[PDB]
Structures are given as C-alpha cells and as structure tokens.
Subunit: 253 residues, 6 copies
C-alpha cells in the first residue's frame, strides 16, 4: 500500500474547503456526516465527549468517504498527539496555541526523530496500516498537516512569531474562545471582535499560511470565504440536530 | 417510591401527542432529542441498530426530561418484550401485528401471571427500581401501554378483530410498510394508500382506541392531526440530521 | 490444554452449593462477586440487561476465581444456547421449561451432532480456547451441565415427565414466577406455594436429579438446605447493593 | 449517491473469490483483515461473539477497502435478517438451511413487499445511507446476495429442491457441521465426507448456482478451487492469530 | 431552559449533606445509587476506572433523581476539568491540592475568560444543553461549585493560604491519603491523625468555607457531623457490595 | 486473600522470560494471547488504542492464565500510573525515561506515602480486590515491579545514573525509538545501532538490573537471549495477525 494522500493538506494551496464540526462523538453519527460531501470533518476531542478509542471509530467510519478527517485533541499534549497520529489522524487542530515555542513543540510532536519527538510504533499503528504501508517511517510527515488555534490575547500577542514557525500549515481562529478572551463572551459578532478577526486572517495569508475559522453564521462564513480564508467550518452537528428538531416541533407546538 | 406515571398512556384520551423518531441509537443523541419538548420519543429497536443495552442507556438519558419514551422492539417476540419491560419501557410499539390472536399474545406478554405471561423478576429490574417501588408487582400493569402496528394487507384484513382486543391501547399505521404491502413501495402519498389510511384512522377512533402514525410530510401530519389522530410522529432524528447538514452545505457547495 | 472441569456439575452429587445471583450486568461487578467465595454465580441473561458480549466479559472476569459460572439465557432459544456454549458457559439454566419435549430439545441444544443439534464452530469458540483444547469436539459434553426451571402450572403438570429426561442434570424452582402462576404474585411465602415447593423438591430428589432454588429469605434458604436441595442461591447483587446503601443512609437519614 | 455495487454477487459468475473468516468480533480486528486483499470477509454472527452493533462497526471498518463483506446471522431469523440488511450487509450466509420452504422464506426475508417480507425503514438505514441513495427502495434487491448453508443430512436430503429456489445465489457447504451430522465429528478429511462434499459441489454448479466452502486445509482448499468452487474461505482470523503466536513461542519455548 | 440549579452548592450554607462514593464506574450502578436518597453522589474519576465518557453516562443516569452529582477528576488537570464541566458536572472535587497558587488555578479552570481559563464550547456541551440554556455563557459560574482536597503534609502546610482563595467553596479532608502522608498508612483512626483532622475541620469552618470528609466508620462520620462538617460521605458502593455479599455468604459458609 | 504474587518480578533474577506484545486493544484478543504460554504479555497503552478501561478488561482476561501482565502507559504520567496500579497492573513499563530524576519520580509514583506519591484508594481498587486483600496497604509494594525504557540519546546520556536508582527493577531498550533517535529510523539492524544496544545490555546487567528488549527478528532475539537479557518480547499480535493473513492469501493470490 502507499500512504493515504492528505487531500486536505494539498487543498490548503489550491481551493477553499468547507467544513462540518462533528461533536456527536460516535462512529454512526460521523458516518452520517461523511455522506453529505463536506471537504472536511472536525472530530472534536476538546469540546465533545471523545477519547482516543471513539476518535478511531469515527476515523474508520469517515475513511470510506471523500470527506477529509481533522482531529482536535483536548490540548497540545505531546503523548496524546502521538496517540492520535498512530490511530491514523493525518490532520490535527491544536487548541489555544500562544507562542512560537509552543507551536514549534507541536511541529516536533508530529515528526519522527531525529527531527521531531513523535514516538515510533509503526508495527501497532493504523497510521502505517500495521506496516502494510512498507515505507511509512520514511514518508509519514509528507501527509501530516499541523493546524494551530489562535484564540486568546496571548495568541494574538505572539501571532507574527507563530506565523514564522516552519511546519505550521494553518492558523485557525476560534471566535468563541477569542471573543471571551476579549471581554465579549457570547458576542463574537461585535465589530471590535470582527475587526481583529479580519486583520488576523489578512496577516495569516500574508505570511503564506492557510487561515481557518468556524462560524455557524452564514453571512460571517461567506464574508470569511470572500476574504480568501482557506478552511471554513460552517456548522456543528449537535447544533444542526437540536435546531432542526426544535424548528420541526414549532410547526405543531 | 411510587411507580413512574405513564403520562403517554393518560394523554391518549385527553390530547394529541407530537412524537420524534429516535434512530441515532445512542444515549447522548437521545438526550439531545429529549431537550426539544416532544410529547413522545420513539426509541426504534426495529429499524435502528439498537439492542436491550443501548435502549436502556436511552431510557436513562430521556428519564430526566418530560418527553415520554415509547420503545419499538424488532418483532413481537415475547422474551424480548419481557426484557424491554424490565429495563423500564412503559410503552411498547409492536411492528407488523396481523391478527387478534397475535394482538392478544402481545397483551399477555405485557401482563404478569396469572392474567398474562410476563416473566417475574422485580428484584433485578430498573422497572421496579430494584424493588424500591415497593408494590410494583401489584401496580405495574396500570402504567404499561401496548400499541400495535397495522402495516400489511393481513393487518387490514384483521383490523376489526384487532380493534376488539382488550388491552390494545392504540393502533399505529406504518405508511412505509403499508404502501409497500399495497404495491406502492416508496409512494405512500398516492391517493389509493391515503384513502386506506384515512378510513383505518376513522375505524380505530370509532372503536374507542388511540390512532397513531408517522409522517415526515408536514401537510400529511397536519391532516392526520385534523382527523383527530391521538399520537403523530412528525420526523426522524437521522433524517433531520442528514437534511440539515445537506441544506447547510448547499449554501456554500 | 484439557477442557475446563465443570466442578458445579461434579458437586451436584457430592455437596450443597451456595449461589449468588449476578444481575449488575457488567464484568467489573461480576469480578467483585467472584472474590466473595460463592460456590456458583448466576449470570442472568433473562432478567438483567445482558447480551452475549456482556455475558462473555463476565465469564472472563469470573474465570480467574474458583466460583463456577452458570448462565441463564432469556428463553430456551436453540441458537442463543449455541452462542452461550461457544463463549464458554458450561452450565445453563433454562427458564420456564414446561414439557419433556421442551426439556429434550434443551438437551439436544447442548450436544453436538449426531446425538444433538449444537452447531459446530470450535475454531472460533472460547469454549475450545480456539482449538487450544485439542480434543474439545470429543470431550465437550462431559463438562456441560443442563438445568431447567419449573416455575409455571404447566411445568408442575409435566414435572414427572421432565424428571425422566436423560441429560437434564437439575430442576430449579422459580418462586417469583411460580407464586405468580399460582395467583399468589409477590407472595411466595404463602403456605399454599411453600407446600408445592417442598413436594416438588422431594420429587426432584426422588427421581435422582439435583434440586435448586433462589430465596433471599434466610429462613426459607436454610429450610431448603435442610431438605437436601443441591443448589441454593441465597441473594441477588442488585438487591444487596440497594439494601446495603438504604440501610447505611437510614443511620444518618 | 448510487447504491453500493455488490462486487461479490457479480463475481459469482466471473471468477473464484478467496475468503477470510472474521471471528475476532471487533471493528479494529476487521480493519486489519480488510488490509490484506481477500476477495471477501465473512463477519461471523453465528460462531463469534457478535451482535448487530458489533457487525455494523465491522461493516464500517471494511467499507473503506475493496474486500467485500458477507455476514452470517446466528440463524435464518427473519427479523434479524431485516436488521442486518438495514445496517447495510449486502451479502448474507444463512446457516443450517434444510428445505426449499426455508430457502424460499430466506429469499422473501431479503426482498421488500409486495414480493418479499423485508421490513421497510429506509430513512433510518445505513443501507440507503439514510435516504442519501434516493431510489434505494426501487434498486435495493439488485445488489442483495443470498447464500444458504447445506451442512446437515436434512439439507443434503433437500439439496435438489433448495437448488431450484429462485433467488438463492449460492450454496455454501459447512464441513464442521456436515462431518458432525454424518457421525465423523472433528474428521471432515475422511473419504466418506469428502466424496459427499465433491458430489454436492458438482450438483450445485450443475444447477447454475455458486458453490462455496471453508477449509483451513490448503490441499483441500486448492482441490475445491480445482473443482470450480466459486467462493472458498481459506482460513479463520482467530485460528491464524493463535497458530502464529504458538509457532513463534515454540522457536524459544 | 434555565441552567440546572446546583442544590449541593446552595446547601453548603444551609444543611449537612450525606454522600455516597460511586466507584462501580457504570451508568446502571450509578442509577441504583441515585434511587437511595443520598444528598450527593461522588463519581470517582481518581480511584475508580472511569473516563469522561463513563462519567457522562453516570451524570445522565443520576440526572433524573434528586441526588446531586459531584465529580472527582484523576488530578487538577485544567483540560480535563474543561471536559468534565462541558459534559455538565456542576461540582468538582480536586484531589491533592497543596498550595493557594494551585487552588487559584483550579478556580480559573472553572470560570470562562476573561476572569478564568475554562475553554468556551457551549454549542457542543451537555452543560448548556447544546445552547438550549440560552444565557449559559453569562450564568454558568453561578451554579459551578469548586471543592479542593487537603490530604498531604504540603496541603496542611498551605491550609490558611488555600482557605483565603475566593472561589474555593469547600475543602474536603482525605483520611486515607492524609494518614499515609503522616506515616499512619491504613490507620487513620489513630489519635495523632484524628486530632489533625478535627483541628483542620474547625479551621475550614472558621474561614467561612464548607468542610467535607469521607468515613465508612459510622462513629467517626457521626462525630464529624457533630463538629458541623457540611458534606460527609458515609460509605462506598464497591465496599458495601463486597461486605453485603461476604456477610450473606457467612450465614451459610 | 493474599496479594497476587508478581512471578514476573521474581523471575527477573531466576530465568529469561519470553514476551508477546499485545496491541489488539481488546479483552477477547488478550485472552487468545493468554492461552499461548508466553511468560509475559505487554498490554500497550502507548502505541495501541487502549485506555484505563480497555486495559482493565485485558487484565481481567489474562488473570485466569499463568502469563504475567505488564502494562505500558502512554507516558510517565504520575496520575495515570496511579490509575493503572489501582486496576491491578503489578508491572509497569515506562516509555522514554531520560534521567535519574525522572526514574526516581517513577519509583515514587509506584509507592504509597510516606515513601512515595501513589494515591491511596484501596477500598475502590481491583489491586486490593476492594480490600478483600486485608493487608494490601502494608504489602502492595513487595509485588510491584517498575521497568523503564531507555530509547533516546538523552536516555543513553543518563544510563549510568538511571542504573543507580533503587526501585528501578529493569531497563528495557526500545529499538524503534532508539534507531530513530540515532538517525537510523526504520533501520535498527544497522551495526552502529546494534553495538550500542549490546553495550547497553552489558551495562544494565553489570549494574545488577534486569535488561529487556523487543525484536520480531528471530536471530536478533536469540542473540539478545545469548547475552543473558532477562525479558525479551519476540513478537507483536497485530504484526503476527497481518503477516499470517498475508502469507495465507499469497498461497492462492
Ligand atoms: Ca451490545
Ligand atoms: Ca473509553
Ligand atoms: Co476554542
Ligand atoms: Co413499519
Ligand atoms: Co423465574
Ligand atoms: Co456450520
Ligand atoms: Co485521597
Ligand atoms: Co519505544
């Protein structure tokens, strides 16, 4: 076998990718999302009740479909990153990155020694298909994509430094965490927040990195797409399930 | 503790109850559905990948919420009915009931001896709260509700006989199974099928039993409500998840 | 490896075995029970939320301990009996056996062809340890023990006939199901029920079969032991958990 | 989406398909098997500790790979067949089929009314991808493959009648169950058994049906392939795991 | 919906709350405990085999009952605290807190920015009921209760400083960990240990914080209640299961 | 009950122990491995998709068999070590140990206060059998075995210092991680790497500690055994499953 191509990583330089947040934490729910035709599915290890085993189940579900899997771990924990890479997550979104030093550690966490600190266990990994991908240890990093979240004042305070870290492919803006950090908790739509978000996207693209964001607001998501944002998540499965069931009940109260 | 009141059973004679089909087969997904405010939630053991243990998890999720749980077993299997009653399902929807003889057996499957054939195991059952409901064996049947599905030609051929079975509280019409049985598979909206459905509802109500149905077609569900149908399911969680995710993506293709 | 010796089966002719009912339906809870030192543990597939996979987990937990496992399936279903024997259950307790014909079918369900109708799949079975027990197909029935429950009027009406079925090792009396069948539901302690139970135990032992019963009443269990009853369960894990927690709270209300 | 093509069904008339038995009962173990390149993988619901939910997990694992999934239910149970078809199993292997009457019932169990008795629940089914395959109810049977097992004397006594049932695509010979049925339990390699197996394969192919078999004996599997047998399973995952680990330990004792 | 009121938090100033330790690590076992009527149930993530997903199941089980859930994470890990708050745990018990600096970090871990460092993900959280609690981000901290454990010499060495940390609602004394720290491992009943425990309880209450403790010794628990200790756990589900089963067997040996 | 004897620990000074790596992450797969007769089974928490609960299931499976269980956590995390010891893992293999300071912390993580920092929770632990091992808190450390991995340049740079840490029973060499650290990633068989491995084994044994290693290369494993290496793992379950299934298919292509 040849390594699974990371089409998400390739498309960061070629097109705008439309994303769905997957927080239903379940292989069956992930499969339903995988049938829709999103460019990418974010399997949320930070804000949905997921662990390594439930994330594997959702990777296996999604693998039969063209949608690309991106995994968010609960934090930039180097041993957890090792685990998520070995179950075969090729794209990682690290929350709350706040310095070039932390971003560089996340780069190393995704690369084998001697260049990085990724633990070597290819015989056991779905990532190498249990060594059925015969050159995995030589080729693996070619198909690994590292994304970091800037979603705090310290992140924005270190934005230019993070954007100069080789091996950070993309910076993703978290409007919920960022708006809270700016004293506008629950109000990311405020002009003060939006102006910082737009300027941040412009600086990310000016440094030649992919910019990303999540907004369930269609008008905001379209504006971010108009600015050239490379990876835009446009909704959340738990939110769409709850809203569609409420909207239906309201037709009958 | 006193037995859990079956408000679904009580409301069959007092109001029209709006239902959501739950086929996401998961305690977390059942909890999301429970937050919406449907009168009843159908935990589908027939057409979703559920077993006794997954149905228990969804009963436990839903129990904290006013929505009433109704469980559909895969078939009118007497030992499976015993299991679903012991985990505390108070309302059952039996598929593909086709004779008064079978409807009578389903009544007995829901009642303790000497009147019925429900197996006795109160010490172990969530239904008795492990005997914390101290008079459970004397009071249990008062809060059990039996619904049967008429959804085949043989069902319709035995409708008057099923409607004279004491202890059948409601007859639910299955438009997918019935339209297929009538040679209109995938086309329940056909006049031939709808005239049979309307007449069946009228006959159910004329015999003093509750009529029920599922339609994801808003206009059909409203017409069934105008005919006085007591329990109408208006949607399915898997369908609402898939449709809402497709509708969202099409705003961005 | 040699087949696991069924010490429960051997002890039916040599001693009185003290049993605990296991309905907490979980490998961790079965392990706690296994540490106590009961002669036997009944893994309840009829009245606890168990399936083949949860029964297997509890067999694996209990296997490290001297307590012998007995499995009760939800009904005398021949394919389920096949499944439970292949995961390695050596003793089965069949509920609600009501004729010699049914008891004979249960004997056959436990024996390989050409004598029986047990399906042959030793390569896949924990029962053969995946053929690591090299003569399993020749020796298996030697360590299989069949118990049937008499717990209905039809059972008592067929008692002498069931007691003449070769390969039924034991008849277990179900006081909850039997007292209900006799119109004394929730009142097995009634003299009318107890006289029938005592005569039934005497008839079982006079036919040279093992007699069994469950009573959480200490005085009743001791009387059954004084009558020579070979296998007596004296309590239920759910009941002991709930009672011990209620008794503790009442010291502080 | 268009229905998933059943390449196993198509290849019954075009090539000889090499099969692996999957009894490790686990989505992760199924995925390892799926990477090898077998024509087909038999997910064993009869002799491995599987239920509908574990079979779904293994279908989802295997779906990303060219290996075709075949599911064996525990018995020819019509409601269980309904469940396995709805989770999207396109090929079923029914154990212990013994008459044309039972084989015809298995055909109907796989077809929608009005021709068959398959329960209609497409909105909820992975089989229709939750109605994302828009014509599923019209096209489904085109990609459904029914295989039946002849593995008893009554089966052989009804072989010519089973082979005249339209909609039986293949007859699979079970050498373990059949050798036991013939009084050669654990000795399928005996000439008396092999001569019956060869004659049975010849009669299956002469009636224009696909013949199938499992043998972990390489010489027997090659002989069956030389006779023109269309689907040959050549090993079992539990057996290969145990034997490879024993063979390795013996190099070091 | 309005936020779930934290009655445990309210009752810290109004009454003495009787608690049960829940380490059976299972939704079914947590439900049995919830039926007893304890003021609070401690879901033990530190010393029972629990993870985020098993804690969620137990929160769902307990939610239908008046008993208030308190969750103990394995350590004061800020990302894990984030996960446990998002699945809807409103009261946390942090083990082995040893400084005001650590206690202050635990306060921040429980509060949204800009005041705290709790990660913002309300759309995905059971805590907000997937935003069905419409003002969750504004009101959440009102119903969050932080308890810290003092159970080491360094803890006692920093007791006055921890007791001056605003947002620590309660200090829980761990007699097993503390007695071990004092060189009296397995001997918390020693006078040297008890005098330190009594003085610690008096100092906690003098600083206007709630004092808590666990003792399975009835005499010790009653003395702690007489001292005015606000939250006293009086037993452990694993201990009561094992003891009740041992005590029963000993009546029959 | 007396504490479970750690025969692995005892045999470090009396014989050479042959090991199998268990990364199939499942109680059923661990049981198959346990039937083979390996001296020890490595339950891999670092490079297989295991968590505390899956590791418990595999401990419970293996417990009925003479094979000794050794657990590798994902990292030298003190709270995770506490969890794995409480579920009853008596031998731990800590990855990527790089200093005497870290090795000393791992020793303390395995010992109760006042000597160590292992959290005290015997009532809840399978390790004490829920206090059914009555003197557990006094005797536990006698049967705990700590192994550390040297598999980086910093490890080798601190080898003499790690080898002088009392309570480190064994140093295990990780050829995959070490060969990558040395710039020979995927090529541990290189002379440069092997000369370092041989010298490291000699130094470990000269300091009176047990040396260990994994090699799936039979000739390398036999050479390590000839050098006197005390604990040698000779294969991996995922690798043996994949290779045996590939080797079988290639006989038929
Ligand atoms: Ca299951
Ligand atoms: Ca888990
Ligand atoms: Co964020
Ligand atoms: Co229907
Ligand atoms: Co009974
Ligand atoms: Co067979
Ligand atoms: Co403590
Ligand atoms: Co390593």
């Amino acid at each position: 076998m040849v390594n699974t191509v990371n089409y998400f990583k390739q498309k960061l330089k070629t097109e705008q990718q439309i994303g769905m947040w997957v927080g239903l934490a379940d292989g069956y729910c992930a499969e339903i999302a995988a049938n829709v035709g999103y460019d990418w599915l974010l399997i949320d290890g930070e804000h949905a009740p997921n662990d390594v085993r439930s994330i594997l189940a959702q990777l296996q579900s999604i693998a039969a479909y063209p949608s690309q899997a991106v995994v968010r771990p609960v934090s930039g924990d180097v041993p957890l990153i090792k685990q998520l890479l070995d179950i075969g997550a090729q794209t990682l979104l690290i929350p709350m990155v706040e310095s070039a030093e932390q971003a560089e550690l996340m780069v190393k966490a995704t690369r084998y020694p001697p260049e990085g600190i990724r633990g070597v266990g290819a015989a056991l990994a779905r990532a190498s298909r249990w060594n059925n991908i015969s050159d995995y240890l030589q080729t693996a990093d070619e198909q690994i994509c590292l994304l970091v979240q800037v979603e705090s004042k310290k992140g924005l305070d270190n934005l230019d430094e993070i954007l100069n870290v080789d091996g950070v492919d993309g910076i993703f803006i978290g409007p919920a965490d960022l708006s809270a950090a700016l004293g506008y908790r629950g109000n990311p739509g405020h002009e003060f927040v939006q102006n910082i978000i737009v300027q941040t996207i412009q600086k990310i693209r000016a440094a030649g990195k992919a910019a990303g964001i999540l907004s369930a607001d269609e008008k905001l998501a379209k504006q971010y797409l108009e600015l050239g944002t490379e990876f835009v998540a446009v909704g959340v499965d738990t939110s769409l399930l709850m809203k569609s069931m409420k909207q239906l009940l309201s037709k009958f109260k």
